[PDB]
Structure formats: structure tokens, C-alpha cells
Amino acid sequence: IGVTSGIVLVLLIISILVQVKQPRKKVMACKT
């Protein structure tokens, strides 16, 4: 229970880290 709650909570912060930093509209066609 604990390791898998640790791995997902790592990936949950990284997904917010990609969502905020990526402009994702028309910028960086091949990046991240």
C-alpha cells in the first residue's frame, strides 16, 4: 500500500509539473 502510494504521488506531482510549465498551445512541437 505504502510504496504504491509513494510512486503515484511522485507521478502526480510530475504531471502537475508538466501541466504548469508546458505552454502546450502552439509552442514546443517536439519537447518534454
Binding site: T4, V8, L11, L12, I14, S15, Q19, R24, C30
Partner: protein
């Protein structure tokens, strides 16, 4: 919630947030998911993805509930994520339906004890009698094929 263990209800929901975060990262890392949403007029640097974090949970929950969503990934690295999370989904719903079709037929096959013969086989339910009474004296004296087993 009975046909699946509470270990399993947590492990589905932890994998529902898990694969949703992986499919979001693996779509940004892939170049094939970047294209133009404007195919009518030609390119004017309008290369754009579709996977938000909000959409990736909507693909995670939307495929778990057997309904589907509007994303439908188109890179080979993202379709393998969708190809496994779909096979993860069938063997949960078809295990939830099959186990709930086992709980409802076991408590329909069961009958309460209705006689001494139905009580002649039970060991969870134990007998009883007044000691040195007219009731106990009958089973000590009896010979008919079941009451001896009830006296045993």
C-alpha cells in the same frame, strides 16, 4: 462493494490515478501526439497536443466505467497504455459481475434448518435437551436411524 476486497478497491483507484499520470507524461514525451487541430487551412505553427491532466483523468475514469472518451490516442507509446488499461478494465468488471453472481446464488441456494434431518448434519448449530427429562430419555431409548445420531 462486497464482491471485491477492500485491498482491490484501493488498488484499482491507485492505478486509476497511476495510469492517468503515466499517460499524461508519456504523451508529452512522445512526438507523434503533437499535430494540428486545424486541418482545413495549412500549417501556421499551430502544432498542438490534446492531453491535459484534466483529460487524462477523464480517459482514466472514462475507460474504467466502460463508456469511453473523446481523446482516443494516436501514438504507439500511448496506445499501448490504452491497450493495457482496457484489458485491465474488462477483468475487473467481468470479475465484479461474476463474483456478484456468486454471492446472490449462494444466499439463494441456502435454506434454513427445517427438520431434525436437516439438523442431523449441522455441527455449527448444536442440539440441546433437559438433562434427566422426558425429552432426553426419548433419544437415549430411540433407535430410528437419525435420533441415535442425534444422541451420538
Amino acid at each position: 462493494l462486497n464482491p471485491l476486497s477492500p485491498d482491490i478497491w484501493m488498488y484499482v483507484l491507485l492505478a486509476c490515478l497511476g495510469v492517468s499520470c503515466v499517460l499524461f507524461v508519456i504523451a508529452r514525451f512522445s512526438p507523434y501526439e503533437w499535430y494540428n487541430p486545424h486541418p482545413c487551412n495549412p500549417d501556421s505553427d499551430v502544432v498542438e497536443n490534446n492531453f491535459t491532466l484534466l483529460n487524462s483523468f477523464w480517459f482514466g475514469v472514462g475507460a474504467l466505467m466502460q463508456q469511453g472518451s473523446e481523446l482516443m490516442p494516436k501514438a504507439l507509446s500511448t496506445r499501448i497504455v490504452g491497450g493495457i488499461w482496457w484489458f485491465f478494465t474488462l477483468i475487473i468488471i467481468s470479475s465484479y459481475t461474476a463474483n456478484l453472481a456468486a454471492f446472490l446464488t449462494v444466499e439463494r441456494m441456502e435454506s434454513p434448518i427445517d427438520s431434525a434431518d436437516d439438523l442431523a448434519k449441522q455441527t455449527k448449530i448444536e442440539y440441546g435437551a433437559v438433562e434427566d427429562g422426558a425429552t432426553m430419555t426419548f433419544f437415549k431409548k430411540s433407535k430410528i436411524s437419525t435420533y441415535d445420531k442425534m444422541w451420538a
